[PDB]
Amino acid sequence: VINYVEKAVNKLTLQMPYQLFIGGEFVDAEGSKTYNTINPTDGSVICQVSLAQVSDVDKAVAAAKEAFENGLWGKINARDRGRLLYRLADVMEQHQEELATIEALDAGAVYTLALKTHVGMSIQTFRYFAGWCDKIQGATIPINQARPNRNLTLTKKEPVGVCGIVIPWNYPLMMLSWKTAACLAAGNTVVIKPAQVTPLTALKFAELTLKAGIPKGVVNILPGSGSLVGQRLSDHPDVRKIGFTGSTEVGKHIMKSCALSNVKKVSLELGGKSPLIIFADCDLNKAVQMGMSSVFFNKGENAIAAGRLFVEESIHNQFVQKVVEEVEKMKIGNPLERDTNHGPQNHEAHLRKLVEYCQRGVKEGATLVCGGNQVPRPGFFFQPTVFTDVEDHMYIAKEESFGPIMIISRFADGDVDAVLSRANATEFGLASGVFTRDINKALYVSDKLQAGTVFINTYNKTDVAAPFGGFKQSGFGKDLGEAALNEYLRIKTVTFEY
Amino acid sequence: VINYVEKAVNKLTLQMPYQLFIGGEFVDAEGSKTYNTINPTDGSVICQVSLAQVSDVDKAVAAAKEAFENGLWGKINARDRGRLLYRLADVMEQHQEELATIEALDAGAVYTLALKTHVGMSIQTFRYFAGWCDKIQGATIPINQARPNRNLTLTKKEPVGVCGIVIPWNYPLMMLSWKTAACLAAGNTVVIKPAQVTPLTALKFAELTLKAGIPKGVVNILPGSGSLVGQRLSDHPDVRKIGFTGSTEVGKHIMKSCALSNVKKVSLELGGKSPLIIFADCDLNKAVQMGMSSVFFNKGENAIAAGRLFVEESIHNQFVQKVVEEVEKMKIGNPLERDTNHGPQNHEAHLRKLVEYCQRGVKEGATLVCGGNQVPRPGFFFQPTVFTDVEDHMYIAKEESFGPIMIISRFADGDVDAVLSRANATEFGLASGVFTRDINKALYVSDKLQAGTVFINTYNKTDVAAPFGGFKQSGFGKDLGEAALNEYLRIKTVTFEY
Amino acid sequence: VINYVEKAVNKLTLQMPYQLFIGGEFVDAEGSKTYNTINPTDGSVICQVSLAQVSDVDKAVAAAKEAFENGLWGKINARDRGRLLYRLADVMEQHQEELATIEALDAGAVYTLALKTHVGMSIQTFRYFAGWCDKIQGATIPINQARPNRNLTLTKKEPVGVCGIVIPWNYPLMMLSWKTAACLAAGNTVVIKPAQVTPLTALKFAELTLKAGIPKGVVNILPGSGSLVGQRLSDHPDVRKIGFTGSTEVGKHIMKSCALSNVKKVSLELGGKSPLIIFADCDLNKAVQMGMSSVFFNKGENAIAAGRLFVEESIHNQFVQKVVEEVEKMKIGNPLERDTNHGPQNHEAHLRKLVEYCQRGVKEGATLVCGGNQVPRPGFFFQPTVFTDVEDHMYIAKEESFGPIMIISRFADGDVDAVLSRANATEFGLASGVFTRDINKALYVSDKLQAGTVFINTYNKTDVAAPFGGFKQSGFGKDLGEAALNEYLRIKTVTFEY
Amino acid sequence: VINYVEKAVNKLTLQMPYQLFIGGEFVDAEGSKTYNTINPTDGSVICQVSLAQVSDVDKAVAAAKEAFENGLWGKINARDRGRLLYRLADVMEQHQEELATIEALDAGAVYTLALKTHVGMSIQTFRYFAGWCDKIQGATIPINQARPNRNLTLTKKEPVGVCGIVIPWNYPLMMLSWKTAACLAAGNTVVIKPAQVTPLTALKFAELTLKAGIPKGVVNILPGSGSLVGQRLSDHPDVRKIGFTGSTEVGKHIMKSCALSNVKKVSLELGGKSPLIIFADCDLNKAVQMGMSSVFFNKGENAIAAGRLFVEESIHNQFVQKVVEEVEKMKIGNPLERDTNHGPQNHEAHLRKLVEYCQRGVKEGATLVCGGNQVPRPGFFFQPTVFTDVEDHMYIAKEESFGPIMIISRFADGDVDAVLSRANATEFGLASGVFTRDINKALYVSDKLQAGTVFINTYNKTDVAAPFGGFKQSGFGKDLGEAALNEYLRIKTVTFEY
Numbered sequence A, B, C, D: 001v002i003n004y005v006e007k008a009v010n011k012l013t014l015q016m017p018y019q020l021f022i023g024g025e026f027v028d029a030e031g032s033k034t035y036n037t038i039n040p041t042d043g044s045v046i047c048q049v050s051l052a053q054v055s056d057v058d059k060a061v062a063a064a065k066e067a068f069e070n071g072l073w074g075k076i077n078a079r080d081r082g083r084l085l086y087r088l089a090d091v092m093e094q095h096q097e098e099l100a101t102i103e104a105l106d107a108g109a110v111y112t113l114a115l116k117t118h119v120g121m122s123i124q125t126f127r128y129f130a131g132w133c134d135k136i137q138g139a140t141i142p143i144n145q146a147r148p149n150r151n152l153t154l155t156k157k158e159p160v161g162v163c164g165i166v167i168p169w170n171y172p173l174m175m176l177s178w179k180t181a182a183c184l185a186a187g188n189t190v191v192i193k194p195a196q197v198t199p200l201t202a203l204k205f206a207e208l209t210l211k212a213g214i215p216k217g218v219v220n221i222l223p224g225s226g227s228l229v230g231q232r233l234s235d236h237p238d239v240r241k242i243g244f245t246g247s248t249e250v251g252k253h254i255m256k257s258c259a260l261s262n263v264k265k266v267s268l269e270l271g272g273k274s275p276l277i278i279f280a281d282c283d284l285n286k287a288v289q290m291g292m293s294s295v296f297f298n299k300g301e302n303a304i305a306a307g308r309l310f311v312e313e314s315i316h317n318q319f320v321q322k323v324v325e326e327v328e329k330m331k332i333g334n335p336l337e338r339d340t341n342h343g344p345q346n347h348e349a350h351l352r353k354l355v356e357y358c359q360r361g362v363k364e365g366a367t368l369v370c371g372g373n374q375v376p377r378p379g380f381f382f383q384p385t386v387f388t389d390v391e392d393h394m395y396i397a398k399e400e401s402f403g404p405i406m407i408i409s410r411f412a413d414g415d416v417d418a419v420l421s422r423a424n425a426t427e428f429g430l431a432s433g434v435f436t437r438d439i440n441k442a443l444y445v446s447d448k449l450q451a452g453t454v455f456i457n458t459y460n461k462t463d464v465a466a467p468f469g470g471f472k473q474s475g476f477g478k479d480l481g482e483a484a485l486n487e488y489l490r491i492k493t494v495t496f497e498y
């Protein structure tokens, strides 16, 4: 029997585990230490959650090690590993409303969006990678023959072993799911560190692995701090790969920590300052809808959010007027209410950061067209914000806000290479977008953009089959698609002479 | 007009460039600094070689950056890039006797072996990767459709950009070629740091890039120290990928440096303590021939060399007797002499390490059956060495010798899992081998060995098409094969709505 | 409501549709023509089944064409097509005992075997191919650029369209499932002709597609004759691909019919005379167990059954002794008796062929060691049979029996190429096998065997992920594995200039 | 020494073999039978060429069989096979002017075009496929494990063996090269039947295989008739695959013949009636140039030639005007004259068909704007032709001309699905094209077009890396690209238990 925090909300009863998940059981942290998780809608404490200590990390890694080396997970057919992950996705679907509601409470996710994206895409992710298990294939290779003898050379794709996954707070279940589904499908075992501020869906997911019959120790979850828990995962001699999503500065530190311990493999999904280039020959009303979406989706807490919009001179003013018209129609409120389409920011410190970010924008000479402030109501709501007259040297032209802040610059009519240059003048390179009806411009622009994803006449169109990853200081390695598996597999070459 | 060090040897007139190669020209280092490269056959100075400074690294990177962004290399068809690399291989083949002679002088590589392997495989490498250029392909992906609209998702494989390659001294031209061929085939430009002690074939290769018509700046080569030149490559803000082959300790430092600068991509080919398991049911005389080769090939200066031989109890004594018989037949001598089987070690400091290594093996109680000493003659020759009665706790059971030292332990008749455990009890995992006529043993052992390559009834059978790389602290990423290309490519996802 | 033949049997009340399945409806054939399906355990009529006429084929093709061109199946996401095929597999699993009982009744499949193989593998097949739907990918190709312009070349994998599937009677549901799963996973629609003698699991399967929510017209099933129904499918101007499994002679006719109509695509899975080579260095008792299985599995009604065993001279006589001992232990009987090892042959005409086949083997000089005749009892049971002293020129050395008839020839101790020659001297090429503990023999023999599958130290080890298909007159194209999809997809090259 | 027909022409001395090429030597046919090859520029006899008989086919097939089974080609490394094919391409390049001149004489190919395309692309083809030799790889597959035991499943890609290649006369050397390069790269040997009317570049190519060191019997070439030589190839019991390019009706007969003999594999590249849809929003002047090329390239003797142009109402008249202006500037003349851009048709019988085709076009009511007639001069020249007012029911809207006849229909402004229906209302499906600046329209049209290739804002843009093949009655299988290899390879599955 598991201890839950119980809550009647959104026409259901939430049953939320709040403890560490180690070796298939929910347990207190060392010293029974706890911390509070905070509801961003009203600022209240949802509940106390166990605070993992170093010895808890070591227990989790040891359970993952044992599950990998001696447990059933390392012994079953790849097909049967697939079946378990497809069952896990089924169980998640059976609990979809509950997961989405927990995500609304914990992260401020608008419930209707959480159901479709945070949760819906997580379910798709497990089903997708479950199908990869018995389709992961090595090669046979026509090497030169040591005559008069013969040679056969094959490769075997094997699991990397014990993995550590460290994730951010913006889509807690979804980021967990993207990386965990690939990690498990490849036959690995894992210790997961959710962001300290958003532990709840991770711990509920942990319970769901029990319902799905995932063997004990295959999945371990440690709410706790990056500087303590995340650090120990990166340092651990028995961890063989870290999958990381978060800030560029933390990613640098993780990669360093991987190097200094045992050269564990690492993948990094880092920040973004993604440019969206909107040409005069686009469909304007549709550009407004998708442009707003590119920024405001999930209250801007989205690594691929367009952090910079370049709008062609002749449509700029009309674009801005229409955006302001639409912004005014947005319903800001409780993420659980059906009319809400803009929820609170994830946590208080992040709201403060956004208020300061916009002050700096104003101070440096950008035009604040609307928003810029906290919404005067309980919780941590921030106004959808539009800046114009943004110049390339400005702080807000360079820094990732990670909030609902549209940052608009003009470019001259007929210019193409000039705007590309400005769009590429960043050490980030996660995503980018272009709106145009012109086939030649679209294809040329997608070639020239220095970003791991280019959207054409859409934005935020991620898919579980489409690889997602950055260039330059946005990191390396892919989440999603077949390519994600390569971060969680090793290749063994076997060469016979006969 | 290029300055050469001319030398009449091996019935040839060598013409050896000795300067830095930057932007298609041979130039002195800053302040005309130089150092001596030493011939290991007699300890003499071959010539002075330019000693690259930080400002020279910056010039080479600048030249690589310009060549990639604006030069011809970034504009030609993939097919035509391939043509140029196939031409480069042809030029290398036209110069193969000269290259192999230079390698004999610089590295002590036995000339007949240098023709076939050091140079022969280098030529194969460029030809192989030249064939990949117009066969590197992305994907089109059946993503969910944003109804009532449609979506197309494709990926493009793009070059990573400016790369740094840092290599060791054991097969100077060949290690350069493995990495450089894959790097260029993927459309990158490069700055190469050969091992300071072995710059000569790299500088002659540089001249061959001119003869093949490789555009200026595509290939830059900087003889010099890792702590200065290599370090600056790892730190440089314009370098986007480092490809590294060398020790585990330098590998850690390189990876950390990649992290702290701009999270440039890194791949690591590190040390090895590769086990070879020889069962009583093997072909014994064959096991002797290949067992000796597994250790003594290229005077043991071979990252995948078997660093432990485990020999089944019932054949152990006969195996050792037969090895000693064959060892006595090996002809030690000048690498340029046709009857030479065993050349000198690469440089003096390494010879010193090997002497100390074997002193320690004797101190700790292993049976020295033969060799262990510097051969009494000029240069840095080391006697082929056999140790028996090696126990798992011993230093020589754990430490990589990187020399011609066969390190033998017994295992009990029938003890498969037990010998496997001992073979895997290392933080290395580069290679491994098994000799047995029994199909079931061979397949089971190859599954269980924790190494990037498993040889079965053979050893040292590498091939330009078969990926080569380690697990655990032997690093990550592959050289050779299609898999090598993945280190030198990035994936851009392009998603349309229409 | 659907009309059923109801039968209380095996603790179940079977509900068996008996009509044609066209456009989601069970309907009588033209003129309400019917035929009898016969129970092989007692020779009784199970029920009457609709007998499809030409106009019925045309209706089925029209329904498939409409389903493909305008129906939901052609509009849903690949992922959602995947979900439907998974759900179909789930429905089949929910009905597995019923399906296995129907197969026991209709084909004489031993119930315990039918559960695990006939039905169990069918379920695995749909689950496997369901996972491929959203992982079918095209390419982006680095073509030469039409300078000063640019080119993008991609491929799209598309369905072929309306398919016809014609299958035999040996594993009715399983052969249906192999082909249909790959067909549907690739996005096609289909008309299936089950063998006339075995229509019942196909018709129950049809009903399961309704329960699973497969759109109307996606699957159509027409019990009836090859010469009428199968012929019209091969001739039809709107059918674009035929997938065929059956005899070599009908395969020739089918391929010819494809040519003469509209050059529709064709894949052919035809006869076998598969050689099993058993060396003296094998595990003998295991060779007896697997050698028996290689012949007797599914009462020999198995296209890959070993049609000749070559047994090395020195073990031949002991091998035969052990086989005879084991053959005597086989329990022949009603497929529903849980201890039955050997069920009846599929239908009466096949039993008669087997009696004649054995009369001919004795006539031409082979030694009948055991079996060779009908078992005296109701139904169509044939004795597990062993022939020795079989020589290469003999009819039974050349002709496929498709029955439980072990056909043994000696080969000389220590010859390998000579036995390989004899094993390869056939125009069939579907499967083959080798038993040996010697790795060198096993690898060499597997290279040299001219057959689409080579088993090593096993037999009949098919897998839904492992491609299955013949060489020479055993046909071409694969069922199962990723390779199977290629028969059901077309490649569209799309080339832009911009 | 080889007998040549010598000819001084185009500032060269041509040396043309004229005999059968069998087992590495030029030999007379049975009975020394010969026939004349005709120069289409003036109708004169170029020379006499050996006329292969049935016994000659049997000799060629026996030579191919021996070369495959026992010769060097079956033994060498895939890498060394690649080297020979690369060397073959170099020899072709060394002879490119001579080959282009021979093709000018034999096929009427304009010399400048012959050099760039007929010959230039043939060289690219051999170099491209040479690169595939050591990159053709099978798989290792994670099948279910027969516990308590283990399984390993791998695939081996093997050659199909002896192949027959039968080709048309439109690009004699190029069609030879497309198929032969893929065939040889996959390790097969071959018997080639050039079109009887165009044997000369094939025979010269045969000589070049000798210069390149291709082992005897690997390439065999038999000038002769399809009804005799081609038929025997399709019938032969030792031929295992036919690669065919030609008419749909001969394709059907070839496939039938493959079926009736030994179910040899077959690929078919058949006719085309390829639609080109030109929207009003395209670049009109570029549409005229590329529209011109789509029809008139290689005097229309081009399987993928646009056989219908659909031009949007509002630009139709202006398009026709501009086309007529450009047609008038075409210089008709001797293919060896540098100012010629429209050469003669390939042979007299084809000229006759083109005359009859346009007579019928006029009879049935289409508007003949220009041409339609044999040019008054010696040889077989045909006036570039433009028809307008072409209606869907008309013979010339349905039947492939394979000549320089532009066939134009209107479609209403803003119609998309309507013109697609009309473009798709054909049993052909080889190529197609769309000109538009609208990205949404271009992508939608490319989805909907029922053809193996879709060109967007270009035409005739083939590439050796881009697969080329038809749908429906245009055949199946690809030439060019990775995909082409699959027609010349078989997959062997090898499954171990251990």
Ligand SMILES: NC(=O)c1ccc[n+]([C@@H]2O[C@H](COP(=O)([O-])OP(=O)(O)OC[C@H]3O[C@@H](n4cnc5c(N)ncnc54)[C@H](OP(=O)(O)O)[C@@H]3O)[C@@H](O)[C@H]2O)c1
Pocket (backbone or CB within 6 Å): A166, A167, A168, A169, A170, A175, A193, A194, A195, A196, A197, A224, A225, A226, A227, A229, A230, A231, A232, A234, A245, A246, A247, A248, A250, A251, A253, A254, A269, A270, A271, A272, A302, A303, A304, A400, A402, A430, A470
């Ligand atoms: N590229 C993508 O796929 C993607 C997706 C989502 C977010 N992001 C990026 O993430 C950033 C926003 O999240 P954030 O600012 O909260 O990121 P962050 O500070 O880098 O935190 C990410 C995770 O790393 C942990 N961490 C901190 N120090 C660590 C250490 N020394 N060792 C191991 N782990 C450590 C954090 O723990 P704590 O809980 O203690 O903070 C957290 O769980 C943005 O820049 C955004 O673009 C990127």
